[PDB]
Design a protein around this nucleic acid. Structure first.
Length: 52
RNA sequence: UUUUUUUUUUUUUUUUUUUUUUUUUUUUUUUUUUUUUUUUUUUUUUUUUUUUUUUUUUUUUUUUUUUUUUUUUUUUUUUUUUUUUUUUUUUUUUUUUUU
């Protein structure tokens, strides 16, 4: 899926019309958005205190 | 439906900086916000010392009675028509959730 390439089509997945249901979202991947964000909030980061 | 930092142009990151500076010190003197002199109870005329007293008195007691600010008699849930007894219910439903 060329994840690592900054000059590629992946970050414009939706607006290019390549895919309609992205496999990288919070709705597609809940409870991995709770993990990680909870860890960062418990590691005293102010960004993760606002994650839903 | 889709989403999920009320994040983001790129840069940047002391609500720091001319240069020089650093007692919101200083004329020189000075240093009781002391002092004429001499005094020192914001004492005293002499008397005097209950903001006591006419005498008499001494419950801010009393006419005599009296002594529940009780009582017609009867009574004694400031109960009761009967019936009743979720200030429940159409049916279906049951996140004041959702493209």
């Amino acid at each position: 899926q060329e994840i690592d390439k900054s000059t590629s089509y992946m970050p414009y997945l939706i607006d290019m019309g390549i895919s309609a249901k992205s496999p990288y979202s919070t709705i597609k991947n809940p409870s991995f958005h709770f993990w990680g964000q909870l860890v960062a909030a418990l590691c005293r980061s102010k960004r993760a205190l606002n994650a839903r």
